[PDB]
Amino acid sequence: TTALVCDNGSGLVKAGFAGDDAPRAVFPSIVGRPRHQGVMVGMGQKDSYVGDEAQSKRGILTLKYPIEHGIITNWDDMEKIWHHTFYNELRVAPEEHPTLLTEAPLNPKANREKMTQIMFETFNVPAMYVAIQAVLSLYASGRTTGIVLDSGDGVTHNVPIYEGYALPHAIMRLDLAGRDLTDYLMKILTERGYSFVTTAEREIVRDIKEKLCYVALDFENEMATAASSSSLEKSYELPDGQVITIGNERFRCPETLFQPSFIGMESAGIHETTYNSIMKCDIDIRKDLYANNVMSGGTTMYPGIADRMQKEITALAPSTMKIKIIAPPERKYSVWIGGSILASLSTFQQMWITKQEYDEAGPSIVHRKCF
Amino acid sequence: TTALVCDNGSGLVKAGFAGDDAPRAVFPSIVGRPRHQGVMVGMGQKDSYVGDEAQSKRGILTLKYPIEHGIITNWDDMEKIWHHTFYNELRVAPEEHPTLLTEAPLNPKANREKMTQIMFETFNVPAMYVAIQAVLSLYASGRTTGIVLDSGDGVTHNVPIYEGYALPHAIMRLDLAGRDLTDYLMKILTERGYSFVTTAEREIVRDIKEKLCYVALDFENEMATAASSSSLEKSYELPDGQVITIGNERFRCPETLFQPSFIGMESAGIHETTYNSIMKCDIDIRKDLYANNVMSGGTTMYPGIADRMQKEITALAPSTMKIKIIAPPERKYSVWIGGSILASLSTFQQMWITKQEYDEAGPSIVHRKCF
Amino acid sequence: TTALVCDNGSGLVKAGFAGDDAPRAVFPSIVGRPRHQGVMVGMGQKDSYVGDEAQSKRGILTLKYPIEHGIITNWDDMEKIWHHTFYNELRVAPEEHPTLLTEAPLNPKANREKMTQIMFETFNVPAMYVAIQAVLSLYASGRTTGIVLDSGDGVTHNVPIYEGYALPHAIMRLDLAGRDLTDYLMKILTERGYSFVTTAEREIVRDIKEKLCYVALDFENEMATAASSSSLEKSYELPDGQVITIGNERFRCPETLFQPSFIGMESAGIHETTYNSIMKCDIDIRKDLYANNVMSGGTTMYPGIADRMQKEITALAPSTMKIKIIAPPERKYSVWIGGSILASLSTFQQMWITKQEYDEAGPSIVHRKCF
Ligand SMILES: Nc1ncnc2c1ncn2[C@@H]1O[C@H](COP(=O)(O)OP(=O)(O)O)[C@@H](O)[C@H]1O
Ligand SMILES: Nc1ncnc2c1ncn2[C@@H]1O[C@H](COP(=O)(O)OP(=O)(O)O)[C@@H](O)[C@H]1O
Ligand SMILES: Nc1ncnc2c1ncn2[C@@H]1O[C@H](COP(=O)(O)OP(=O)(O)O)[C@@H](O)[C@H]1O
Ligand SMILES: [Mg+2]
Ligand SMILES: [Mg+2]
Ligand SMILES: [Mg+2]
């Protein structure tokens, strides 16, 4: 039988079969419940929608995300989402397929206890595994060395690897990702009057960000240019025809990644975090880590991120080092692709947590056979 | 047992069984009593005449409408009208048929509380249920969603719906309707010397309104044409052979709907009262409401109201929208058609307020089950 | 030279000299224009009215507010109001008096830009300044650490301040204030048959809300008691001598502040707003914020509001964190008293935007020299 691969992204769930080059079913990780008094019988049924059928009817819905900063926060909702991904998107029976979930580094352990318990007692998958997304991303690049800078909707994290041996002490994590950038955009937009207040309008500001934002190579130069000319402004059309116009908001939002003092945080930017992660690693290996700066996750899709990161890290690291930021075109799906590759491997068969293992050991077993 | 459907409009009573596509009994809502002395015996009796009879003797009667601005004020007269409807018109005892009574939004709760009291304690129906009119209007059109404009004899209200879910905070009620247009037409005919005063002559200026009134496309240019030549004049034959002629009084009267400042009121004309109702909805669904604008009720029957409405809204809403005024050909009875459809459903049986529930709950029960 | 402190409210304008502990002039911020036709010669002149002379005549006027949600919607009218305050009320030649004005947080930049432009060019004041309203609201209390809850007629907004250092990420601004409660009260009044629809009647409903509305502590049980008997009902004599009797509408109105769903808004109540604001401030200062909540603005003068908000915040914070709400009885004018104090301080004399500085810098200086 062929195992599945279900990447529980913070924002979007990725799913697909083991061996597929690309995921087969992608849909935002939302649960919607209406917030108005229904009037028509035979109509407005299905108290709760999931994924696509909650986006396409969000006008009257309260969209709750069940995954917050990479940590599942509302279990009965994630159960519905898994049930959907299994029985409606892929159209598969879970009991007859192994599966490969994922997790971010340094998440509370009870999180993965509960993931495993749901998978084994509710859906009765024969065997399942829980990887760490950065390792999978480094698989996907077809590589053996690097410092995966992964960042998606919830979290931004680094994971240095050298010739197959992880360096757990050098891992750095940071809760500043796509959702926080969106929430800061909602706020900088009110300088022009555009008030977005509802959970549904978060999904409009998200796409405004996705389509219009970019990261300036140099922030102060871009601020000056925007202030002294209109060459940057770009106009966007709401769902209801209103045409909004944004200028320096196109780069003031992505720039949050590098100066988290914009959104009130104290910690340092992603470039400084990566440098401080490399400098935790033994002297003999930093030379290769500087030369394999892999990237992953959606939030690294902004134009100008790769060049900005290369410039900044070159500013940090010594003059003699050969920095290289690697940005695969499919980096949004790198984690899932690597997961498929790992699941298809010939030597991975023994590594599963068999149903018998859970029977004889409980959910705590998942800490001995996982990274 | 078959279920009855009644629609106690402010202008006419529409009543008849479910499953039919047209009301069985249609007649005006007036009870007339003599204002003169009856000298002859046997003939000249029955101090109260109702419905069509009252009109046929409107010479020697004072005609009272028990309903004014959708509110039932004279309860004795209204009970008379219902007694006529049940026994003389439909010929079927109310003691053995569930009933559905239409009603208007933002009405005093005492209104429907007393409707329930009267139906259960005076006529002893097995079960009754009260429904809004815009909801049923939408039912008739076979739609899932759309902004309904309903404008009968007394009350004009908008109820934007979405996928079977309404928006109570987006309702508007504008108590300016056919009766007020009749009064203003009566007031502006005197510019020619046709002094209509009596109520019986209100029943005739209303006939003039129903026959000749039409809504122009541009008021200023129509006035220009009217001043230019006699092309717009048309004549009408009173009951005693006199022939009248009216020019710009034909469209100056429906103009009220678009400029209630004509009759002193301040609230904005139906174009603005519909635009402002859409512009209070979730920003997501406005594009949907624009393209599914429904109409209903008699007052929307003026030749050309749909085009003026479309013009005004398209001049208000963003240029990218694709407006559509859904005007059913039978829109006069649309409320009752929708009521028949709703009463005929198999899964609507969960909504009837049974005699048992009223007896052990009191009239206040009607609010727990009625929108 | 004496300075002027002009707190432009959305419903009232509190303006006067700095140093006093009360404004020298208060008048509603409405510009009325006659709407009927004048017939008597020697009358009908002065075809645009302002303030209280636009109350006592409101019978024959359409009342329009310049500010809708702390935003200056109209400028041709706000110029009239400012001219009125400077010349007719205070009788002061503005060309020789520094003026200090106010604004809310997250308020569009063009708003204060154009305020500066008008004051420096239309009136030609030697110097001026604009201050957020939570800063002044906290000055008036004499503290230096606390999270203000300003609740005006148009806007409700918190500001966490610690030792004089604001927390710009934790400023929660909610556009739901006294005016929206006025409109909700008008909407629910009809349930009893009372129908107020026009601008003038909106003032009557404002006074009804002021006099009779109050906040309950347990809304569900308050409704239970109100339904049980008429113990809570009180009467009000409209200006023509009519008498209305409002019952549960007394506290169903200001309950909206703690359940913004009633009017369709999604955000959580103001207690939840304040608590969510607090839990985003670094952990060590939450203790000092939980004990220094300062109320302000007119809409906070509901009876029982302080008890309700204290109870509800206790329901959200942990058990051992002291929770207090400081509510000065004079709080309606807290913003203006803070403005007076700030203008009086000896060290503030350098913080003005001088006419010279504007002349050589342009409006953008407003965002530079002012917070
Ligand atoms: N082309 C893009 N440009 C900028 N941001 C993007 C782009 N595509 C996705 N994002 C952002 O990245 C996040 C989704 O990336 P993804 O890696 O799928 O997150 P997750 O793995 O948590 O589901 C979203 O917050 C989205 O706003
Ligand atoms: N063909 C028509 N043209 C213009 N006005 C009409 C026409 N028919 C009815 N009306 C007006 O609409 C009112 C009756 O229509 P209706 O929709 O049935 O109101 P209701 O249902 O409350 O009784 C009358 O007052 C009349 O003035
Ligand atoms: N006792 C009261 N109860 C409730 N609301 C009140 C009371 N007094 C005044 N208000 C409301 O406060 C508002 C005006 O007060 P104010 O603080 O000055 O608002 P603004 O900042 O715009 O000037 C009005 O909307 C009024 O309805
Ligand atoms: Mg990911
Ligand atoms: Mg009608
Ligand atoms: Mg204020």
Residue numbers in the entry:
A (entry chain E), B (entry chain C), C (entry chain D): 5 to 375
Excerpt from the publication:
ATP-hydrolysis-coupled actin polymerization is a fundamental mechanism of cellular force generation. F-actin polymerization is coupled to the G-to-F transition, a substantial flattening of the actin subunit that renders its nucleotide cleft active site competent for hydrolysis.
Reasoning that continuous conformational flexibility was limiting the resolution of the 16-protomer reconstruction, we focused on the central 7 subunits. This revealed complex displacement patterns that were dependent on a protomer’s strand membership and lattice position, primarily characterized by subunit shearing around the nucleotide cleft. Notably, bent ADP–F-actin displayed significantly higher total strain in residues adjacent to the nucleotide (7.5 Å distance cut-off) compared with bent ADP-Pi–F-actin or the straight ADP–F-actin controls. These were broadly consistent with actin’s nucleotide cleft functioning as a deformable locus that coordinates mechanical rearrangements, the rigidity of which is dependent on phosphate occupancy. This suggests that phosphate rigidifies actin subunits to alter the bending structural landscape of F-actin. Our bent actin structures support an alternative model in which phosphate both rigidifies F-actin (consistent with previous studies)33 and modifies the structural landscape evoked by bending forces, enabling discrimination by ABPs.
